[PDB]
Each structure stands twice: as structure tokens, then as C-alpha cells.
Amino acid sequence: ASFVPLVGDPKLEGSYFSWVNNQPSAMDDYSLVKTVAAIRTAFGPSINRAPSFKDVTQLVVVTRTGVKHYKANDPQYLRFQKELADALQQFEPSKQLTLGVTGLGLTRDFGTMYTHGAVFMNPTLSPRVDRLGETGGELPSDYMLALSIMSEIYFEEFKPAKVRTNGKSKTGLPNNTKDAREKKKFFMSLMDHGTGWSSALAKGDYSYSAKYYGSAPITLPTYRDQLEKPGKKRDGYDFLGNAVVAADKSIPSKYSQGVDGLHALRRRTAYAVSYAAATPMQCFVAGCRHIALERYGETWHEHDAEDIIRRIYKYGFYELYDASAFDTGFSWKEITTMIDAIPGITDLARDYMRSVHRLPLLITSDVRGVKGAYLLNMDKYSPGLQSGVPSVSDFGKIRGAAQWSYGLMVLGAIRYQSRAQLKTEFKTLLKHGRPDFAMQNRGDDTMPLAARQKDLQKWCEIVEGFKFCKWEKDTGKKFIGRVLYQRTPESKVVAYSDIVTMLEKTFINERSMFSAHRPFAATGNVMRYEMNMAHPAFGAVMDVVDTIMLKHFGVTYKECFVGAQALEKELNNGVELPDYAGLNQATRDFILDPDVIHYKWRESDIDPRVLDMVMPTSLEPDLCEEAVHKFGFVK
Ligand SMILES: [Ca+2]
């Protein structure tokens, strides 16, 4: 009972079907029918719909006479986008000085600006269960030791912390509501079950979850759109299991509106783990995250752009590396090694955290026009690092630093005689106590630091040769979203935000302006304008933008969004965000992208006034402390 047809009665590929049949069914017929009825009661349209295209409002023009919404598929907006993209081709990636790019702070041209804001590629590359978690090369014993020690350091101390859940997100199953009031009542009821709920999920007994809440905890694969360079080919798998070599990026005539030269959006696959399964794990994970990012903030955290540059000049030489398929090559052997290394949690907590990583998947269609869906009753499979797991940002920070700390063990700078001493020399490296080596890591983004340039080249040569992970030099020289700029070889190095990203998140956005995910779109575009005024490439790029903005809309960049601020405040029931002068940069970046707290800043770094308006639910530290004990996780 592993494969469950749901909508179009799809037929998987043989290599996939014969493998799924050999896998034992995750749920018995009692819980399966109870769950199938729940994924049909809810997700009615989402399960029976075809991909088609997107309905996104990209620009809202406020005039004395009227207000016009320009969508991504509007013909007048596509002619503006085509002309602005052509007018921005005069810019090219600038030269890189010893310690950063110079001249115009451009790490890439405005090429992605040809991406059609409403059309995504077909087929949207979908995950494949039997080919996930592949490491390729063997995992060394010294690396698995460093990975266990890095995880032990990260989850060494637990201090109950405030857990906020996005009010724009669903709860999945069993309970399915965006309501903030229902989300907390649903968690209080889960506390009353406590060990009975945790033991059922830790044993793969999804019948208990269906007895009291009507369904079983499943993970829903969601979509996250992205812009793409022209001529980029995407290879992957089909939602039936077939293999796609070159995902079609062409724009159909109904959507191109005659505007040639455009290509389609890349649609990445995300995961939406059940709120019932993720939240109890989040109540413990959040308690250790705010400690790890504070004790060892020299590696995994930051307070402002001036902390990165200061750590750079403390050692002298740096490089920038990105991990190729970091979440895809996340083997299950590495996950359990990190889970088993966590001190303070019971064996019930370890088995509970494993089941959250690999919940049964409800696969939906990606082929354009083909409406179909099925439920993979899979409990024991290598899932990689699903983006919905509460510990995705923390396991990424652990594995990334453990792979570079293993490179120093191969290099010989870190020689180990015991676990207790290796844990100590790792703590010193993380706190940047070593005078010769350090690093700044944020998952798949790592900047190794060294006092001698030849020491850094040897260290980077080692991690590139690793076969269990692909580390490649970042050609863009961006860390997080920070461009490293150096005016002249004599001037100091300054960090700037990429100006290409400003126009990306303004004219080719993922979600509509003033929508549920972007309630402060006008004010958010104003902050990007004022922030990037000091950017070296601000005068040249905005002279081009304002020229094309006036030619098609009769309003400049700042005029367009300052006038829309009056419309924004009215649409949000007079709710006025506090002026950015009183907010920190963490709150600033959280206003632009609400999904910043999940990858960059902490929940305690956001101002409480702004944090309450976006995140309605909030589990207090005393409620999390009661939960982690009631569920039976803490020893
Ligand atoms: Ca980078």
C-alpha cells in the first residue's frame, strides 16, 4: 500500500514503481483511508488543478486620476520589462580587486530580468525519492566524527525560546487552518497527548494521529519560484518519475503577448512538513539555536555588515565557496549521526525527530495541463534536507562547518587525540580563537578565513577534492546577500547589497504586491531605494530604470512607490509600520523577506512591534518548556 492514486490515477515509471512497490507501506489501511479522506476534504482545488501560469501583480501606479495594477502577463508591462532588460544589458560584471569587486558593484548583469513573471518552466522538476540523499563518495570516519562533535556543540545547552509560526502558512494535516487562534489551540491539544503523541510518531504508528485528529502527519511539497539566467538548462525528474533532460523555458504565444526574448521562471521544490509534527520539534530546536548563534556567532551569525568585514581584516585572506546540491546530497547517515549526537534528548526524541524528516509525501502534478496527484506511503526513505523540517537551518550550519573543520583535520592544523579535546579545539575555531584559521558559514555559503594566503589555498584545495560534497568557488563573490566592494586597491573593503536583486524583487517578484505575503510592498521598495543609494552602481542603474519607468508609466522609481504608500496604509487598515530609523537591520531585512528569520536572522533580532504584525501565533518560552517535557524529549 505504498502507492496511492488520488486524482488523475497516474502511472509511475517502472524503475520508480517497482522500487515503491518493494517499499513497505507507511500507514495501515485504517489510517490510510482516514488520511485519504482528509486530503480530499481539504486540498480540493490544490489536488485537482493543472499548473497553468501565475497571477501576480508586479506594479501599482498611483495617480491623481486613477490607480492601475500592472500584472506579470499584461502586454503593456511586458513591453516595459523587455525594454528595461535591453537597456540594462549595457552593464556587465565588474572587475574584482584583491579583496573585492571595484567600480560599479556589479557581480552579474541584469540578465535574469528577461524572466517572465507569470510563466514557469514545464515540467517543474519534482523530487524523486529513490535518488535523494546520494552522497556519491564515501563518508570519512574523521568527518563523521567532526559532524557528531559539531552537532554536539550546537545542541549542548537548551534555554526555552519564543517560537512564532507564520500566519500565512497552512498547518497541513491533520488540522488544516491558517487561523492563528486555531494553530495555538491545536498545539495545546497536542501537549495534552504528550508522550502518547510522540511515541506514535516515533514508531511510525500514524493510526493514533488519525484516531484523535482525523488524519496522519504528512509533508506537502510546495513550489518556490526563482528567476533564471538566459540559456540556462534545467535537468531533473518528472512527477511520474520520468527523467527530464532540458526543461522547456520557452514562453507560449498566449503569454508572450508578442514580446520575444523572454524565458520561464525556475520553480524549485520545497517541503511543508506537518504543523503537528514540526512544532514539538521546533520547541526544542529553537531553544538551542539562540544559544549556538550567540556562543559561536563568529561563525554562524552576525550583528551588522561591519562584523563580516572586521573578521575579514582580522585574518587577511578570504575566499567564497558555495555548496552544489547541499540539501539534495544530505544523506540519512549524516542526519542520524547529528541526531544521535544531540545531548539531553531522550531516545523518544531522536526517533521523533527522524520521523519528521521523512513523513509521507503527497505528490502533486507538475506537467502543464495534466491534473494528477498521488500519495507516497513512504516512512523509511532518505529525504535529504527537506526545507520544512524545523532544523533545516541548523543542520545546514552544522554540516557546512563540519566539512570545513574536517578539511583542517586533513590539513593538519587540527590534530585530534580524543573527542573531548577535538570538541575544545572546535569551540575555539568557532569562536575565532585561532590566530591562523576561521570561517563564516551560513549553510551552503561559506567564507574560509586564514592569516596566510598559501594556508588558505591548501585548505580550499582539500574541500574541493571531497567526493561526499561539491564545494565550488563562488564566481559572484557574494556572501549571503552582501557584495564585497573595494573602490581602489588602497581603500577599505565595504559590504553592499546586490543592486541586481533590488530590481529582481521589484519588477519580477514571486508574489503580488499588497498580497498576504507582501503586505508592505510599497514601503519595502522605498527602503530598498534608500538603502542602496550608497551603492556604487546606484547612479548609473537608476538613471536607466527611471528612464524606462517614465517612458511606460510616467512616474519614476521612488515616485511610484511613495505614492503607493498611501494606498498600502489604507489596504492594511491604517496599520503603520514603525519608521525604519527605530528598527534594526534584522527587522529591515525581515520586512523585505519574511523568510529571513528561517535562514539569516534570529527571532529575537526582530523588533516586537513588527514581529507581532507578521507572526500572529507565538509560543512563549514557558509553554515550550512545558512542551519539551510533556512530549518526553528532555531527560
Ligand atoms: Ca556565496
Numbering used by the authors: 2 to 636
From the paper:
The replication of RNA viruses relies on the activity of RNA-dependent RNA polymerases (RdRps). Despite large variations in their genomic sequences, viral RdRps share a common architecture generally known as a closed right hand. In most dsRNA viruses, RdRps perform both genome replication and transcription without the need for primers; during replication RdRps use positive-sense single-stranded RNA - (+)ssRNA - transcripts to produced dsRNA, whereas during transcription the produced negative-sense RNA - (-)ssRNA - serves as a template to produce (+)ssRNA copies from the dsRNA template. Although cystoviral P2 RdRps catalyse the same reactions, they have distinct template specificities.
The full-length φ8 P2 structure (residues 2-636) was determined at 3Å resolution by molecular replacement using an AF2 generated search model. The overall structure of φ8 P2 is roughly globular, consisting of 24 α-helices and 19 β-strands. It has a typical RNA polymerase fold and resembles a cupped right hand with finger, thumb and palm subdomains, which together form the active site of the enzyme. Despite the low sequence identity, the overall fold of φ8 P2 is similar to that of φ6 P2 (Root mean square deviation (RMSD) of the Cα atoms over 540 residues: 2.1Å) and φ12 P2 (RMSD of the Cα atoms over 534 residues: 2.1Å) and displays all the conserved structural features of RdRps. The main difference between φ8 P2 and the other two P2 structures appears to be in the first 50 residues at the N-terminus. Within the thumb subdomain, a notable variation is observed where a compact loop consisting of four residues in φ6 and φ12 P2, is substituted with an elongated β-hairpin structure spanning eleven residues (β2-β3) in φ8 P2. Because of the high concentration of CaCl2 in the crystallisation condition, a Ca2+ ion was modelled at the non-catalytic ion site of the φ8 P2 structure. The Ca2+ ion is coordinated by the sidechains of three aspartate residues (D323, D446, D475) as well as the main-chain carbonyl of lysine K479. In φ8 P2, the presence of Ca2+ ions could lock D323 into an inactive conformation, coordinating the non-catalytic site instead of the catalytic site, that hinders its ability to catalyse the reaction.
